[PDB]
Amino acid sequence: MQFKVYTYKRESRYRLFVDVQSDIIDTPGRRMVIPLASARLLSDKVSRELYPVVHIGDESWRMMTTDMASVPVSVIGEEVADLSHRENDIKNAINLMFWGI
Amino acid sequence: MQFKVYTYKRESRYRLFVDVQSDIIDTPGRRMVIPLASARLLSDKVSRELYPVVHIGDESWRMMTTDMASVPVSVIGEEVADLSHRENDIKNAINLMFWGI
Amino acid sequence: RAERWKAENQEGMAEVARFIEMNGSFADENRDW
């Protein structure tokens, strides 16, 4: 569901992602999502407009917008957070990637 | 480069894709693309808003918007067409995928 | 304006690309075509 954060059930250095696909667009078995990387892993030279920083509990995360991907429903784990309050920033990031913005 | 159509240097059901990433957003070594399928393979119920029909020479192709994915430059082949004249419909399709109506 | 955006961000974008190369691409992990 759009703007919800889920555990990623695949062996990977990524552990969480945020669903960013429209809820009115049905793609059976798949959802487009943006993976999260620990914010400590990226410097301030990295655009926050394109790669937003989000805080979930005691962790800070960068949204790796350009590494977005549709994933199989089989790797979508439990919901762990909601980022709907960051809709404007997320929309701005995705629209920047495609349309420069 | 945005709106150019390239061959795909991997065995796959998809053989061509259109680059849809902004030219001002430079992700060294990767680009976001949407694969094309021969248009005759889709029925007329399938929305041309979400899945536009585009032409390369005499032949028709459907843009498989919901199969968008980034690819490494190592698999990006020959430029075979330029769809910049369909930027408006391409924008509409991508905006539908993320933001619905 | 576009060149201003590219310039402000050239270092950061190079940094992200190196990060993805080292960390693994989520996109590559999941592409089904």
Side-chain angles (χ1 to χ4, degrees), chain A residues 1-8 10 12-43 46-48 50-58 60-77 79-87 89-90 92-100, chain B residues 1-9 11-39 41-44 46-58 60-101, chain C residues 2-5 7 9-10 12-20 22-33:
Chain A
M1 184 173 184
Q2 198 177 39
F3 307 125
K4 298 295 198 291
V5 185
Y6 303 90
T7 299
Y8 180 36
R10 195 191 295 283
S12 179
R13 299 190 186 192
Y14 288 115
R15 312 194 289 280
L16 296 176
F17 55 71
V18 58
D19 184 320
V20 297
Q21 183 170 321
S22 172
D23 293 332
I24 208 170
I25 302 295
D26 172 48
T27 48
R30 317 273 297 175
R31 292 291 289 177
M32 176 63 82
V33 312
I34 291 173
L36 303 183
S38 185
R40 81 177 196 273
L41 261 26
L42 292 306
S43 87
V46 179
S47 173
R48 289 164 80 101
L50 182 56
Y51 300 102
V53 170
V54 299
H55 307 94
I56 302 164
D58 298 304
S60 304
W61 300 100
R62 280 273 191 164
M63 293 188 60
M64 302 312 295
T65 304
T66 56
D67 202 21
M68 70 170 64
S70 63
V71 303
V73 160
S74 67
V75 305
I76 307 176
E79 172 182 335
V80 300
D82 196 346
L83 290 175
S84 63
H85 65 282
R86 296 295 296 282
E87 171 170 13
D89 288 341
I90 292 171
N92 284 347
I94 290 169
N95 284 335
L96 177 55
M97 180 178 171
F98 293 114
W99 317 125
Chain B
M1 177 167 66
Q2 199 173 38
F3 310 121
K4 296 291 181 158
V5 181
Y6 299 91
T7 64
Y8 181 30
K9 301 176 171 181
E11 182 181 56
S12 181
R13 69 196 181 275
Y14 292 137
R15 312 312 295 125
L16 300 176
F17 47 66
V18 59
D19 183 319
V20 295
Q21 180 170 324
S22 171
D23 291 329
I24 84 165
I25 304 297
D26 182 17
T27 49
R30 299 185 70 80
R31 298 291 287 176
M32 188 63 65
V33 311
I34 294 182
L36 307 181
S38 176
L41 300 177
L42 280 66
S43 72
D44 61 14
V46 179
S47 168
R48 301 194 183 202
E49 299 296 296
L50 185 55
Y51 304 96
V53 174
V54 301
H55 283 258
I56 298 171
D58 309 325
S60 301
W61 299 89
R62 281 271 193 160
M63 290 186 56
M64 303 304 296
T65 304
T66 52
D67 290 330
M68 87 163 56
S70 65
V71 293
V73 292
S74 62
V75 303
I76 301 181
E78 287 262 328
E79 175 185 328
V80 297
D82 187 345
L83 293 173
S84 60
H85 55 285
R86 299 297 299 282
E87 62 95 40
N88 189 56
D89 289 336
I90 292 169
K91 280 175 174 168
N92 286 346
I94 290 168
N95 289 335
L96 186 56
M97 166 87 166
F98 291 94
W99 319 121
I101 60 172
Chain C
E3 289 306 306
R4 280 192 253 113
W5 207 95
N9 291 282
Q10 190 275 329
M13 301 301 282
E15 179 187 340
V16 171
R18 293 188 302 266
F19 172 85
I20 297 298
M22 169 180 74
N23 180 276
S25 168
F26 185 80
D28 292 345
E29 292 178 359
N30 290 286
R31 200 174 72 251
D32 78 1
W33 55 266

